[PDB]
Structure 1
Amino acid sequence: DFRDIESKFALRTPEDTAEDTCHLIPGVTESVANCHFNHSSKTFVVIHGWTVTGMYESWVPKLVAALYKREPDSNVIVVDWLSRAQQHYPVSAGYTKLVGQDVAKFMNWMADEFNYPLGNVHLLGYSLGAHAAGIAGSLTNKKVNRITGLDPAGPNFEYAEAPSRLSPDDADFVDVLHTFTRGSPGRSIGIQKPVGHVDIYPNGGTFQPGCNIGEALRVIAERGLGDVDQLVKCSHERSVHLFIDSLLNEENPSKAYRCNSKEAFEKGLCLSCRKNRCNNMGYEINKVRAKRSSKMYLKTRSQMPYKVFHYQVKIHFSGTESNTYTNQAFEISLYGTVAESENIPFTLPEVSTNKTYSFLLYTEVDIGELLMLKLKWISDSYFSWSNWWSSPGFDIGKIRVKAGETQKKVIFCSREKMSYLQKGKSPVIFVKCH
């Protein structure tokens, strides 16, 4: 009952992270002895996804190299979607079931011949591979510890059920990286419905910064003609790049936050995590169970380090003139004890008086503590036309910034009288106080 495999399982090593050297044929125990397999250590399983070409994508070598870097003396298994994924995309959607059955048979054979503990295997799933793993494991008798996927496919999986798509019950623990969701429901490539016990929605899933418009023209540019095809795939690989970055930087994991909605997170009222919230993201994620879908949010840098901070702010606006204004740009800057940002902007419409506001700010440099603050208010009338005549202004009292990683209700504090924030004027300084 091991003749309908048609999907070769490879086993690379740190010295060779490019070419598949081994072939762990199910049933034929000879391969296990042929290629060293530490039955005591943990063993990952990478499941790549659809590829227009006839070869592995460019990210697998880096992923596997980083995996060995993080956890040496641990086996790695790769699959051979090729010969089946090259077919029409819906055909791959159908063949997900066959590959899942194949992987389940593989794991069952391993647990029968070698009784390898199932609690030491990850089904790293990308693109269609995540759904493939999800449909897999469920057939396994002893379940699976981790089924962490990457950018689960949306088409032909929304409006579905657990047997036909990744489900929380498919494994003991699960987490997904919703790195792309822009578009109408049920048609965006990236599924938006939460699937795992904990889900991550970096940047809100609308898009990612480390890219540009991309395709200049159908013929002049390269839609899938290499070149700018990768640029077109702005976010679909950002999941794997984020995962590998987190794996490499184990010392300082990025702390994704738990909230209620993307707009709520943007406002910044849902950052404090006294309970089991705001868990880590990546390999060092904390294993936790939830009574329901638990959305999360965070931000990131462009490409290389990621790992940004979060310093949401509140303002107790209280002035004299009561003419409400809307759609105004606020610019602030902060200085600390390690480094300092200079000209970070942000937006806050519907400004009023005798009212308190709040917003979310992010920086991409470590600052540690924070001493003083800048609160410049920008205008489109730089020249001396609007430098004398009375322009709208407000008064600033206290400021209640809250550090993200460490809960610090530091109370910033306007000076005795030297604030009077005004349009087209120098910022207002603040200091630690109280």
Structure 2
Amino acid sequence: DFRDIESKFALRTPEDTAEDTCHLIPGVTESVANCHFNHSSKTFVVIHGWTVTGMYESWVPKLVAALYKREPDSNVIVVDWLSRAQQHYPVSAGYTKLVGQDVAKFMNWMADEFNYPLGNVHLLGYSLGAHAAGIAGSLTNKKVNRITGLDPAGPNFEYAEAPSRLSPDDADFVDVLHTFTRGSPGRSIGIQKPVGHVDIYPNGGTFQPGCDQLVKCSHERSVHLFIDSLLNEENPSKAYRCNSKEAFEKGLCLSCRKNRCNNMGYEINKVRAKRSSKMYLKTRSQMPYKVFHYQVKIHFSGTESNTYTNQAFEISLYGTVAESENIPFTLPEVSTNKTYSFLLYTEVDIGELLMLKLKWISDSYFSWSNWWSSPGFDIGKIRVKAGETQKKVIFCSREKMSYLQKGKSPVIFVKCH
């Protein structure tokens, strides 16, 4: 029963990360003590996804070093694919049902000879690798601990059966990233269906703000968002639970009570749910991928009832540690006696807020534009609710300069209570 294991195995060291020296063989037991498999720690299994060349991709010799820097004295097993993945795509879409059985036989061998606990096994998966890890685990003697899927495959695995894809019953805890879900239903590269216990949509999941290397740009963010979560142990990147992509832009759903607002990546909290769990956050185009989240509610008031549209504002943020000066945002359908809310983000740490400017800029540039007296409003209060630290401050002004007018000097608000 141990000659149909052509999908090989390997074990890599922190001193040698880019090679495949010490192999493991299912059935031969003189090699397990040859690769120095430490029987006390956890075990990472990294399953390779699709490829078109003969070698590995470029993210595996970085993910090996990241795992060996975050969790020292552990086990990272690299599964091999290079006689089965270099094909066309419906050809390699059928080999997952065999490679998952090979991995299941290997794990049952390790759990039935050496009495391995199967309680400290992470199953990392790329686009085909996540479905490989999903078809594994269901064919084990008991439940595996955690399967992490990084932007799984879309086309032939959507509309399929639950024992055919990465289903939420495959393990005890499954988290799935959804970086590249742009396209029609059934014709997308990533999968559009929520499949895990926790389902994170970074930037909504349509694309990523960085787009042959440029061709696969927003398909490698599901690895570069995980390497960053392994490196930044002390600083987690929170993700926020909402109900739709359009509602998160209005900022009505920054609520972190009753099993909401989980983390993203390795430091996620094991929380089970009853249904699909869509979660949201925003990112940045560089190697620190953390941004903060602020909610701003603005009360408009005045006398002259005049509606407008597509007005551009500029706001500042003045706090204890540092400051943010020229954040732009727009609001359509501004009018009197309303209460508007939106979402605001930044990449500079603030601390606790002190003051806040508010400028309503002018689209016109001509020397004509100083006349034809500009529209204005009477702003009383701004409610600000921070994202992580749940503080709800109140801002107001004095009984002077409380009149925002387009193309004029901005108002300045202070801490009001």
In structure 1, how many angstroms separate the alpha carbons of the residues matched to 2:352 and 2:60?
39
The more displaced of 288-297 and 321-330 is 321-330
In structure 1, how many angstroms separate the alpha carbons of the residues matched to 2:260 and 2:71?
27
The more displaced of 329-338 and 164-173 is 329-338
The more displaced of 403-412 and 345-354 is 345-354
SS in 2 for 1:311: strand
In structure 2, how many angstroms separate the alpha carbons of the residues matched to 1:57 and 1:374?
48
In structure 2, how many angstroms separate the alpha carbons of the residues matched to 1:382 and 1:246?
46
Asked if the contact 1:382–1:424 (Cα under 8 Å) also holds between the matched residues in 2, the reply is no
In structure 1, how many angstroms separate the alpha carbons of the residues matched to 2:275 and 2:143?
20
The Cα offsets for residues 179-224 of structure 1, whole Å up to 9 and x where unpaired, read as 111111111101111000111000001111123xxxxxxxxxxxxx
In structure 1, how many angstroms separate the alpha carbons of the residues matched to 2:397 and 2:161?
56
Asked if the contact 1:325–1:352 (Cα under 8 Å) also holds between the matched residues in 2, the reply is yes
User: Is 1:110 aligned to 2:93, yes or no?
Assistant: no
Equivalent runs, 1:2-401 vs 2, <5 Å: 2-211=2-211, 229-401=212-384
Asked if the contact 1:258–1:277 (Cα under 8 Å) also holds between the matched residues in 2, the reply is yes
Deviation at 1:172, TM superposition (A): 0.2
Asked if the contact 1:268–1:358 (Cα under 8 Å) also holds between the matched residues in 2, the reply is yes
In structure 2, how many angstroms separate the alpha carbons of the residues matched to 1:426 and 1:6?
72
The more displaced of 100-109 and 417-426 is 417-426
Deviation at 1:384, TM superposition (A): 3.3
The more displaced of 418-427 and 159-168 is 418-427
SS in 2 for 1:350: coil
The Cα offsets for residues 292-313 of structure 1, whole Å up to 9 and x where unpaired, read as 0010000111121111100011
In structure 1, how many angstroms separate the alpha carbons of the residues matched to 2:402 and 2:367?
21
Deviation at 1:19, TM superposition (A): 1.0
The Cα offsets for residues 233-286 of structure 1, whole Å up to 9 and x where unpaired, read as 221101110101011001010011111111111110001111111011111100
The more displaced of 88-97 and 380-389 is 380-389
In structure 1, how many angstroms separate the alpha carbons of the residues matched to 2:279 and 2:126?
20
The Cα offsets for residues 20-71 of structure 1, whole Å up to 9 and x where unpaired, read as 1121111111221110111110011111210111111100111111111110
The more displaced of 321-330 and 381-390 is 381-390
SS in 2 for 1:431: strand
Deviation at 1:396, TM superposition (A): 0.7
SS in 2 for 1:271: coil
Q: How many residues align?
A: 417
Q: CA RMSD in A?
A: 1.0
Q: Which has the higher strand share?
A: 2
Pair 355,156 (structure 1): closer, same or farther in 2 beyond 3 Å: same
Unpaired runs of at least 5, structure 2: none
In structure 2, how many angstroms separate the alpha carbons of the residues matched to 1:210 and 1:340?
26
Asked if the contact 1:386–1:424 (Cα under 8 Å) also holds between the matched residues in 2, the reply is no
The Cα offsets for residues 327-348 of structure 1, whole Å up to 9 and x where unpaired, read as 2222211111111112111121
SS in 1 for 2:125: strand
SS in 1 for 2:93: helix
Asked if the contact 1:253–1:280 (Cα under 8 Å) also holds between the matched residues in 2, the reply is yes
Asked if the contact 1:301–1:307 (Cα under 8 Å) also holds between the matched residues in 2, the reply is yes
Deviation at 1:377, TM superposition (A): 1.2
Asked if the contact 1:135–1:162 (Cα under 8 Å) also holds between the matched residues in 2, the reply is no
In structure 1, how many angstroms separate the alpha carbons of the residues matched to 2:286 and 2:142?
38
Deviation at 1:385, TM superposition (A): 2.2
Deviation at 1:382, TM superposition (A): 3.0
Deviation at 1:383, TM superposition (A): 3.7
* Identity rate, percent: 100
Runs of 4+ residues deviating >2 angstroms? 382-385
Deviation at 1:157, TM superposition (A): 1.0
In structure 2, how many angstroms separate the alpha carbons of the residues matched to 1:413 and 1:315?
11
Deviation at 1:354, TM superposition (A): 0.2
Deviation at 1:128, TM superposition (A): 0.6
SS in 2 for 1:147: strand
Asked if the contact 1:197–1:290 (Cα under 8 Å) also holds between the matched residues in 2, the reply is yes
